[PDB]
RNA sequence: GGUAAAACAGCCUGUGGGUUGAUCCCACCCACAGGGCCCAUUGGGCGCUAGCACUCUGGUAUCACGGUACCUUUGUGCGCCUGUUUUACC
């Protein structure tokens, strides 16, 4: 099928997992080594359920910009031998707009779901649930709950992580390369 | 988890797929190159639905032994550019008994299912549905339908393909290395 | 012109030489001469902000020592980008 789906299936097979925390079930994306990404509201504790099996969290960083502003991403280091495929090369320096994107989701509510979203525009400031948030990306698609964590993709590019919606629009936290230079 | 579970998950991720034919939904195992294996009761036609994608069948063989006896396996050559991981090294030259096995199934009825089976005994002749059949492997897990095609595994070894059950006992067709010297 | 197909180029510079759409900036080609970089080297390979898949040369972790995960190199199929052809179709 489309080159984006070929890209998207591979990304989900090699780098994604289903995660349960105290606050729900999420798609989770492994960046490299043992570092992965959840939406901030997942609030992962000392251990998580990764594909129905308990895994310890060695470290959890909640991203904010230079000013202290929410970015709606939590990076967590997983206590497991396996390393993720290194997809930092698929992350861009700064926010990415595309004319057509796929949002991929893998949870028990939404198993193997590859949603074509269309135009992704760089949105910037958003008031998520009372919290000033920055580096939002926006796309025009009727979103539901339980989609947070979904990986927004384009052929050869990982744009961000779905972090919320409003009924006709969905919003992803941009996933920037320098977030993972080290941590 | 088990060394066997690590093995089975790897096998399903890299080598299995869900297949629909005119005769139901099946777990399917890729052997190498583009050769795969199904139960004969799948009876694949000129195309199959492989992970919801139409795939053409270049060639299909229903296995018989030198004596002409049913083996309950269909080998099919898939018209795909991508090639399967070569797992012929995990196949034995003759039927294998193990004292501990996992049967792995991936259909919409049975998503991401890894059934611990226990002893696998070499059963030999079976009268499947009125057809003299040979090289049956027998294991005792009161089984249900839609499990045909499940992969019977132990760490480092692929024993066979689930082809039927009886309420108490389950049966796999043994998957021997010389079946694939050239296919 | 489109519109399909095919088919063949792509390391980077200059040195020519033409041609070129045209007489001007080009674009191509035709060649030469340098500089390279990679590999597993009598050799190979080097368009990839577009990737996917297997395979191969080595590593590193881990393991119930059967495997598993990742990195790295070799190749091959599919895809993609530029051209240059050729053929239809309108």
UniProtKB/Swiss-Prot annotation, chains A, B:
It is found in: Host cytoplasm. The active site is at 41 (for protease 3c activity), 72 (for protease 3c activity), 148 (for protease 3c activity). Residues 2-180 form the Peptidase C3 domain. It comes from the Viruses. It catalyses: Selective cleavage of Gln-|-Gly bond in the poliovirus polyprotein. In other picornavirus reactions Glu may be substituted for Gln, and Ser or Thr for Gly. Interacts with host TICAM1 (via C-terminus). Major viral protease that mediates proteolytic processing of the polyprotein. Cleaves host EIF5B, contributing to host translation shutoff. Cleaves also host PABPC1, contributing to host translation shutoff. Cleaves and inhibits host RIGI, thereby inhibiting the type-I IFN production and the establishment of the antiviral state. Cleaves and inhibits host MAVS, thereby inhibiting the type-I IFN production and the establishment of the antiviral state. Cleaves and inhibits host TICAM1/TRIF, thereby inhibiting the type-I IFN production. This is Protease 3C. It comes from Coxsackievirus B3 (strain Nancy).
């Amino acid at each position: 099928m489309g080159p984006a789906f070929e890209f998207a299936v591979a990304m989900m097979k090699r780098n994604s997992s289903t995660v349960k925390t105290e606050y729900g079930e999420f798609t989770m994306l492994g960046i490299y080594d043992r570092w992965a990404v959840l939406p901030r509201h997942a609030k992962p504790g000392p251990t998580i359920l990764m594909n129905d099996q308990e895994v310890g969290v060695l470290d959890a960083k909640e991203l904010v910009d230079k000013d202290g502003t929410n970015l709606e991403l939590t990076l967590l280091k997983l206590n497991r031998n396996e390393k993720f495929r290194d997809i930092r090369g698929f992350l861009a320096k700064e926010e990415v707009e595309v004319n057509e994107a796929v949002l991929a989701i893998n949870t028990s509510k939404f198993p193997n779901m590859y949603i074509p979203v269309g135009q992704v525009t760089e949105y910037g400031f958003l008031n998520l649930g009372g919290t000033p948030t920055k580096r939002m990306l926006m796309y025009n698609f009727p979103t539901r709950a339980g989609q947070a964590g979904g990986v927004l993709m384009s052929t050869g590019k990982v744009l961000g992580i779905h972090v919320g919606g409003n009924g006709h629009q969905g919003f992803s936290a941009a996933l920037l390369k320098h977030y993972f230079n080290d941590e």
